[PDB]
Amino acid sequence: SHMSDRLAPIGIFDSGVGGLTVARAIIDQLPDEDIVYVGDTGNGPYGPLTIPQIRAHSLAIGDDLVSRGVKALVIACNTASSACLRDARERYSPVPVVEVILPAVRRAVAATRNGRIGVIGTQATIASGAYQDAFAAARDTEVFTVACPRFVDFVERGVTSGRQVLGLAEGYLEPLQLAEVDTLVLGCTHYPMLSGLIQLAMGDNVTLVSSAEETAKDLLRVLTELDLLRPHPDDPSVTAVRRFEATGDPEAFTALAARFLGPTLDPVRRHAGAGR
Amino acid sequence: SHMSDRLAPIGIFDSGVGGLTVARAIIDQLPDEDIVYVGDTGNGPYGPLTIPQIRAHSLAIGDDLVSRGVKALVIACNTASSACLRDARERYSPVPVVEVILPAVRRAVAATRNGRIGVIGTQATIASGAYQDAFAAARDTEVFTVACPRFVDFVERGVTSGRQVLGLAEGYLEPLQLAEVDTLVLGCTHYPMLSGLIQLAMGDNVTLVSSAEETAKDLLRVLTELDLLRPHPDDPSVTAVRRFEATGDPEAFTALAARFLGPTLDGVRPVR
Ligand SMILES: N[C@H](CCC(=O)O)C(=O)O
Ligand SMILES: N[C@H](CCC(=O)O)C(=O)O
After folding, report:
1. Which of A211, A231, A249 is the C-terminal boundary of a domain?
2. In which order are the strands placed within the sheet that holds A10-14?
3. Interface test with B, best of A191, A202, A204 (most B CBs within 10 A)
4. What domain range is B132 assigned to?
5. Which whole-number Å values give the CA distances from A252 to A16, A237, A259, B239, B269, in the listed order?
6. Would residue A148 show up in a list of annotated catalytic residues for this protein?
7. Is cis: bond before A192, omega within 30 of 0?
8. Taking CA atoms, which of A149, A151, A216, A273 is between 20 and 30 Å from A124?
9. What are the backbone dihedrals phi and psi of residue B223, each rounded to the nearest 5 degrees, phi first?
10. How many folded domains does chain A comprise?
11. Catalytic center at which residues (chain B)?
């Protein structure tokens, strides 16, 4: 029924742990929604892969989530979305698909002043033509794209300021500076963690657009116009059920998740057993 | 000459728990930095108070953090910032002061297409004239300001979508819609939690500017320029020391902090 639709969880999937930037932004906007997040740590990263390989891995997860019963499917990974942008809507219909490319593209079109827009992302994302095709539907805009393959490594290791990563960013970004873009889509789950460094390299006249923020807001809009929001609980002891799944080692998932989740705030020892 | 130790922590303070949006954004950008966060839950909220009241509460905490040796001071609270924007830098010099009004103001000036910019925030923030003063250098710019006092309540109770809060937002935001602003400064710690609802109310053309995000990037720039970044540890078992203090009830602080920090590793346990 439509009521049972409102009660289903939101499915989110990503190539791995970086998609938690999208999950965290969604939870910020939609605290009442139940969440199932799947990170494909056992088969990623997707960045360096071919389109057939990316589709095989990511559509297996999306098919599974939809088979399990989600009210909406969020493709949090820019690389996975780039590989199935043209067919995921029909593949999962009538389940709404919210993904990370189009909300940022739409925002960037509205946000540019000079009509010259840059996109950065993984190799597979940029090579796929997905952003290029999406921006083709925008009058009076020109798009320029750059792949930044080493950014994911730097983010996961926690090196997101200082001279070394600035030099790396400068090398990648120079063609966008030469093209005089005034808007830059952060087309990768990991790049919100580099926004300060990228802003330093691009200067103050370049508007950065976060995939996580625009997708989180887009999901709220989509659920609102479909009347699919989970009703706010009257009992304040009721809180959302959020489940996190890894296809690789869960301990490695946990260790890397601290890069993307909020900090833990700053514990008696006891021997556990059934003998007392 | 003065002591400015890159190994010392960054001090962040706020009227309460809402400033964790700023602390979270800073930590996103600067994972290696030690942090001391103070939220004035024992004396806030600041929104409905007078300027002498806001200054007395917030400068007490700022003075404490600086006396404790922080290498940089972040005023995460838009209301506190509005009350001491004119004198905080001089008061704490030579300790760098980064706050939440100026970086978003500079961004909004760059971001507008039609030159019409809105600002929303607490009563005290909007009445202070601080944003009007910050925008005084903006040419070919018209600025419109609106106070949204009940937004803080709705954010803290987690009511940030649906018909009731949309109607609240429309009542506040109508003067900005009539002014046809195309850029909107979220001039309050709590308002990033309403960005989806506010974007709905304002339409898809309006660029929202987050104070937390622009201030986090500005701190990275400032620490970089001053050669003040704490170095990346070579042993990755070494992690940043982060302390979070409240002037009010500490259990109440911990409970409300979840609204702004999101799920954390204390509770997340992944399955295979
Ligand atoms: N999640 C991927 C980044 C990591 C990967 O290459 O798998 C993306 O957003 O493009
Ligand atoms: N921290 C305040 C919001 C809460 C309060 O009124 O104290 C601000 O940013 O304006």
Report:
1. A211
2. A97-99, A72-75, A10-14, A35-39, A242-246
3. A204
4. 100-211
5. 11, 32, 12, 17, 11
6. no
7. no
8. A216
9. -60, -40
10. 2
11. 77, 188
